[PDB]
Amino acid sequence: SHMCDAFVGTWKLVSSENFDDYMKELGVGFATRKMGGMAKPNCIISVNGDVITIKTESTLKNTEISFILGQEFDEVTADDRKVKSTITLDGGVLVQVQKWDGKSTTIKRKREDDKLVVECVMKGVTCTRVYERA
Numbered sequence: 219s220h221m222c223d224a225f226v227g228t229w230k231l232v233s234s235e236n237f238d239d240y241m242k243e244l245g246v247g248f249a250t251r252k253m254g255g256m257a258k259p260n261c262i263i264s265v266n267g268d269v270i271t272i273k274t275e276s277t278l279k280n281t282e283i284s285f286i287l288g289q290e291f292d293e294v295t296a297d298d299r300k301v302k303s304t305i306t307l308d309g310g311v312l313v314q315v316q317k318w319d320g321k322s323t324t325i326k327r328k329r330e331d332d333k334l335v336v337e338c339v340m341k342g343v344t345c346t347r348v349y350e351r352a
């Protein structure tokens with residue numbers, strides 16, 4: 219268990235593996251995959267009381283979520299899915315599930331040495347994205 223404070227910061231994407239495959243497995247099209255593949259977002263994580271905010275800022279598109287751990291929320295994803303999301307803290311890992319149309323995907327954010335490591339799973343595809351502090 220890392221606590222929410224190990225996460226707070228401004229993080230820049232430095233590596234990504236299998237992200238096009240992850241988007242493809244979700245059904246995303248060529249145009250959105252084209253914007254996402256070489257994007258290098260900044261992820262800005264902040265807290266105030268029970269509310270955590272995660273901003274994902276990129277040249278071609280910005281998105282943001284705010285949530286309370288364990289409380290489901292509606293989310294419009296970068297690829298325009300309308301999902302129901304729940305985020306919890308398990309062993310220091312922020313575990314997000316998105317549910318829509320009988321499907322689910324998991325985004326797990328963990329602190330590992332100097333890295334914010336983001337594991338994105340859809341079916342048999344596993345993508346790993348690594349951020350470092352700006």
Ligand SMILES: O=C(O)C1=C(C(=O)Nc2sc3c(c2-c2nc(C4CC4)no2)CCCC3)COCC1
Nearest residue numbers: 241253254257259276278279296297325338347
């Ligand atoms: O924060 C992260 O690293 C994570 C994601 C992310 O950064 N996605 C980003 S940045 C960005 C785009 C997309 C994008 N994602 C998706 C679907 C895969 C969901 N389609 O487009 C498109 C517009 C340009 C900027 C995705 O989910 C998990 C973890």
